[PDB]
Amino acid sequence: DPAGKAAQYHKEYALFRSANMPSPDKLATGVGFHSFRIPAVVRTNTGRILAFAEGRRHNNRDYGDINLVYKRTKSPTNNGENPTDWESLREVVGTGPHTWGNPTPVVDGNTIYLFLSMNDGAYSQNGGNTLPDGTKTKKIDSTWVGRRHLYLTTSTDDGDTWTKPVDMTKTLTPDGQAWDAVGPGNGIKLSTGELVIPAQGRNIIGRGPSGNRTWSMQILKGAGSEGTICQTPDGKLMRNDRPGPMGHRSVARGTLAGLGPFATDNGLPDPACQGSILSYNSDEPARTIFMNSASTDRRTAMRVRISYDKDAAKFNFGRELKDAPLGNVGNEGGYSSMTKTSDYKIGALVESDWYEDKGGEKSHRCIIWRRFNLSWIINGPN
Numbered sequence: 001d002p003a004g005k006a007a008q009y010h011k012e013y014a015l016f017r018s019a020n021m022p023s024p025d026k027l028a029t030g031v032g033f034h035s036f037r038i039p040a041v042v043r044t045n046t047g048r049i050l051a052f053a054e055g056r057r058h059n060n061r062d063y064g065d066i067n068l069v070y071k072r073t074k075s076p077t078n079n080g081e082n083p084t085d086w087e088s089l090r091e092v093v094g095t096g097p098h099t100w101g102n103p104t105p106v107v108d109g110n111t112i113y114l115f116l117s118m119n120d121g122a123y124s125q126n127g128g129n130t131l132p133d134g135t136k137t138k139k140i141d142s143t144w145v146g147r148r149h150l151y152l153t154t155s156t157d158d159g160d161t162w163t164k165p166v167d168m169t170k171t172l173t174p175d176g177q178a179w180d181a182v183g184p185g186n187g188i189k190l191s192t193g194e195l196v197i198p199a200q201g202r203n204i205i206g207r208g209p210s211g212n213r214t215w216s217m218q219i220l221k222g223a224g225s226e227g228t229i230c231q232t233p234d235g236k237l238m239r240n241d242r243p244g245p246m247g248h249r250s251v252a253r254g255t256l257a258g259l260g261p262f263a264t265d266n267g268l269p270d271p272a273c274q275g276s277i278l279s280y281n282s283d284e285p286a287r288t289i290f291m292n293s294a295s296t297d298r299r300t301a302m303r304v305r306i307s308y309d310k311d312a313a314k315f316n317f318g319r320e321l322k323d324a325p326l327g328n329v330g331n332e333g334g335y336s337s338m339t340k341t342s343d344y345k346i347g348a349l350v351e352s353d354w355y356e357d358k359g360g361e362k363s364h365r366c367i368i369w370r371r372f373n374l375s376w377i378i379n380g381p382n
């Protein structure tokens with residue numbers, strides 16, 4: 001790989017700073033956040049980087065009052081190189097005591113589409129959970145009030161502002177469904193111009209001229225809840241999904257006409273956690289990048305890998321992110337998101353956990369921004 005001849009480059013720092021950290025991230029209203037989780041990142045066609053997360057207000061739990069927040073690079077050209085290259089925290093949507101999350105963006109010319117999941121603030125995936133006011137959540141169910149919804153917001157000004165989110169649940173989620181997820185992480189634009197967004201048990205497909213899309217569902221058999229999508233160099237689609245049981249990624253390949261069966265990929269261990277994937281380039285040699293916790297049982301084994309295969313069948317060992325560790329951010333590892341920057345770097349957001357209350361709801365969570373070049377990955381010790 002000719003990119004492996006270059007000098008290695010890596011740089012890393014916290015981008016979403018939890019309430020317990022110095023200079024914690026807050027909205028201009030003064031609203032701060034206990035934890036930030038569930039990253040999503042995209043480079044827009046200006047070169048500006050948009051980073052999204054769940055601002056989890058009161059604790060680290062996936063239910064409750066959670067606002068979908070973001071930051072942009074201050075200019076289209078700075079590539080998020082340094083902490084001061086980023087704007088202060090802003091909000092996409094935070095209405096009510098509800099959960100707004102699962103950011104799943106895709107860039108489509110001069111429009112950025114952002115899919116997201118939502119539930120009413122009184123409900124949680126398991127039910128029976130205690131909220132900050134002492135009330136107990138109901139279990140997410142199939143009722144309109146109690147189900148997980150799917151919303152869509154758009155920006156036509158390089159992420160400066162966002163439309164009022166549109167509830168698309170009635171057309172883009174199956175009738176009768178209770179729990180649901182979109183992404184989280186990102187969707188894609190195909191070489192043929194369609195948009196594909198990964199969701200629980202399905203793809204969401206956007207068709208039409210750039211910026212004037214209409215959306216349909218592609219229902220999948222055996223897909224996971226939290227999926228990733230990419231178009232591999234052969235032009236085919238691939239779903240690489242978080243498994244139900246801990247063990248390995250679950251993968252399927254196909255086209256807009258349908259995907260083949262999902263099967264466990266024994267080359268990609270995974271602890272039942274979200275991962276991310278990126279078509280880095282389609283020219284020779286074509287590269288697909290994959291990031292997850294490369295472990296059957298913990299989230300603290302983050303690994304970025306390259307595949308040169310036309311169908312991304314096999315990835316290399318790649319590189320452990322602990323080779324460029326960051327102090328003063330807790331224990332790095334968890335959900336992740338990747339984009340390619342204008343200056344030929346991979347930009348990755350990666351969750352980190354201060355772990356103060358161990359697995360408990362009071363442990364503060366923050367998000368790291370990493371940039372690295374192919375050389376950094378290629379020339380990893382292993």
Ligand SMILES: *[C@]1(C(=O)O)O[C@@H]([C@H](O)[C@H](O)CO)[C@H](O)[C@@H](O)[C@H]1F
Binds near residue numbers: 125
């Ligand atoms: C995530 C996690 O940290 O494991 O889990 C998902 C969800 O609980 C699982 O996919 C099982 O359905 C949450 O939606 C996400 O916010 C995060 F917590």
Ligand code: NA
Binds near residue numbers: 066096097098
């Ligand atoms: Na809110």
